[PDB]
Amino acid sequence: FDRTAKPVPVITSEVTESLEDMIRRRIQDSNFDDLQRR
Amino acid sequence: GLLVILGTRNGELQLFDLASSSLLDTIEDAHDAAIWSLDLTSDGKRLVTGSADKTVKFWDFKVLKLHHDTTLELTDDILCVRVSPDDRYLAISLLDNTVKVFFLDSMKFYLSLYGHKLPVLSIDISFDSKMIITSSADKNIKIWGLDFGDCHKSLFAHQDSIMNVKFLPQSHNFFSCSKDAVVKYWDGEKFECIQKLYAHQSEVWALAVATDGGFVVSSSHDHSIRIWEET
Amino acid sequence: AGSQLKNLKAALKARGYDREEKKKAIAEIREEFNPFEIKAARNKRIAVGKPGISKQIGEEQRKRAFEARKMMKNKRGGVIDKR
Amino acid sequence: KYTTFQGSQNFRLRIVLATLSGKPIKIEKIRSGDLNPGLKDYEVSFLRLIESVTNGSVIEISYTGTTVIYRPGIIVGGASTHICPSSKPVGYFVEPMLYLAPFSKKKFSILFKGITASHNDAGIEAIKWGLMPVMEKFGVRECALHTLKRGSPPLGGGEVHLVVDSLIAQPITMHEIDRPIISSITGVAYSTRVSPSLVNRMIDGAKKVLKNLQCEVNITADVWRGENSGKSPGWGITLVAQSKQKGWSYFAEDIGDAGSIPEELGEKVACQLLEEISKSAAVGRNQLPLAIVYMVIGKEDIGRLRINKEQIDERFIILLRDIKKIFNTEVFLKPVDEADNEDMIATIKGIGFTNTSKKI
Amino acid sequence: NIGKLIYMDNISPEECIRRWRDLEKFVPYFDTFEKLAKKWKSVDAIKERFLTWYELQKAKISKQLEINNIEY
RNA sequence: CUGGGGGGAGUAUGGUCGCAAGGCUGAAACUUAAAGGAA
Lengths: 38, 231, 83, 360, 72
Prior knowledge:
The PDB classes it as ribosome. The entry lists the keywords ribosome assembly, 90S to pre-40S transition, cryo-EM, Dhr1, Utp24, ribosome. The structure is cut from a larger assembly and holds chains A, B, C, D and E. By secondary structure, chain B is mostly beta strands. Chain B is built from no helices and 22 strands. In chain B, strands 4-5-6-7 form a 4-stranded antiparallel β-sheet, with no helix packed on it. A 4-stranded antiparallel β-sheet of chain B has the order 8-9-10-11, with no helix packed on it. In chain B, a hairpin with a 3-residue loop joins strand 9 (about 90-95) and strand 10 (about 100-105). Chain D is of the alpha+beta class. Chain D has 2 domains: about 1-175 and about 275-355, UDP-n-acetylglucosamine1-carboxyvinyl-transferase, Chain; about 180-275, RNA 3'-terminal phosphate cyclase, insert domain (Dihydrodipicolinate Reductase, domain 2, 2-Layer Sandwich). In chain D, about 30% of the residues lie in helices and about 30% in strands. Chain D has 9 helices and 18 strands. In chain D, the strands form 5 sheets. In chain D, strands 1-2-5-4 form a 4-stranded mixed β-sheet, with helices on one face. A 4-stranded mixed β-sheet of chain D has the order 7-8-10-9, with helices on one face. Chain D has a 4-stranded mixed β-sheet with strand order 11-16-18-17. Chain E has helices at about 1-5, 15-20, 35-40, 55-70. The longest helix of chain E has 19 residues, at about 55-70. Chains in contact: A-C, B-C, B-D, C-D, D-E. Chains D and E meet through helix 1, helix 7, helix 9 and strand 17 of D and helix 1, helix 2, helix 3 and helix 4 of E. Strand 3 of chain C pairs parallel with strand 4 (about 60) of chain D. Chain B binds one RNA strand through strand 14 and strand 15.
């Protein structure tokens, strides 16, 4: 049968590891999307 | 035992012993320029002398005198020689940032190991004749696999200059003494530093390992000679 | 009490050209200072589960089951290994 | 019911020709008088590759492993992957797929994963530059062996994407009643996980042997850097001689191992190539099997191909005996009518083959 | 002679080659490298090997048919 | 010192042929020197 929407993603150790090394790349290159004070 | 070969700064080689007096014989004009490194074969009857006249030479022992028979002239000032501990390879370190591994039985030019980026000091061949070390003034020693000439590690030691590097007798562990008053004990499998020995005060010019058992002596610029044993 | 950041800087000053000591120390502080991949209950008289690891093995199991069924789906032969 | 063969010789050719002909075979006594008797793992994984490629074919290995029953089925192809064992490289499994490759429902897009080269097997450059042009002029037009990464032995770790995408009906009838004039001689010297000077040493050795013939020598050079290099050090050299007016080619390859001089290997492969040119006439000694297989599964006409005296051997005539054992056809060796050499012209009347799997 | 030897299938293939004068191994049999070196030090042995539409289709098929007859 | 496609101004492009991105260099088979760059 066909199904309407994709289910909510299960958060496993692989996706936490991928997300953490994304954060590590951004945080060692200081690629921060902060607000800048006018 | 009881017999010493030696080469000097100028074009001279010399032979001494233990029971009798100094000179068995000297060979004036053993080389045109500064000799830099010699090595016996494991049976001892045939030795190799590489010198800064851009030549290496081979010598045999005729009966207790030296027989020059062949000479390989290179394009560049050879400054280290070594043979394998099973008469198999002749690895020679040139001033042109490289080493060359030859076959002793053919002068075959097996390999050229390259990429050290300064002139390159002491070599060592392992007991299985599979793994070589390569020290230089680039403050790092390189481990090479001799079957295909492929590098394994390029580990950065020794912040001045590694003067000498020597294996243990039966293992793939090795020692390297350097120009910044430190000897260092490594393994050839995990490539850790096993120990960081800190007894000298100045430039450690040489070290020598026992043939069996494995206690190592190191001798330096502060006129000191010191022994290192097991615990 | 004291911050996880303060305890993390203290753990780095605690642990401090060897490599495997750094591999061991980094893996130790990662699996120590990651508390959201364990689950802890409260003892009424404590790490009681490993949610992300259990999830990834439970979904890799059915992933290889699904690929095996997709490989089986329109086959008609098969080797008969009687060895 | 079953055509019976004995012994584990020509095993891939027997299973391949049984798949082409659609005839149930038995292969009996697979090394039965031996210490570890039976089928080996690389030929068992070749059977698994046959089950991947076809559909509805039942293979039935015995208890002892020394006899196999192949009742073939429809070649369907599809996209697949094959994790072949360390006992044989990817060439051992992509060589017998080049016969079954243009005769399936869906086009062959397989990627093999394992060791790339071996001393006693086909390489990537061997398969490509030698064995693809003979198919390219036997009728297929879109065939490609891609290397995504390559792995020298013993650890390997190299993947090879075989893609054929011309699904022909039957191969055309060959007519090569000439010896093709060699226009150029090219090659490829490859090395993985070693220094880039070994490739130039191999090239210089091969070309210093080749320098006295008055043709043009060109050897391309590839070192493999990065993850594309695989898990082991290795290096090798493959030369081809190229007839450009028709497209024919004659190849020779080898690989070096622990203790091998690259100038030695280059001059060895160069002299082995020149001997293949000597003992060759319009095919190679290794391009000859699938050449006469495509001639025997062509149309129901006469196709003739020139061969020389030295290409006849026990391998060639055991090939011919297996061909006649499966689908009952003979080759007719008529000699040429000029006598400065000994060349036969093998005429084969092809069986009435079509591929009946491709949907119309 | 050679075709009768090939398809006379009660004699071994090496016996066919012997009285005229294995495929898992892909690359063919070569000599020793030393014999091949002394054989191919010379080069001159192989220096001479070195150096309307409807009616068109009908002509191709009649060419194949006359090839069929003159080789039958 | 004879040879000629078809207007002007533009727009789009899942077609074909090209040219072009990455990402500190040295530096890869080596997590490797000096020096340089950047901030």
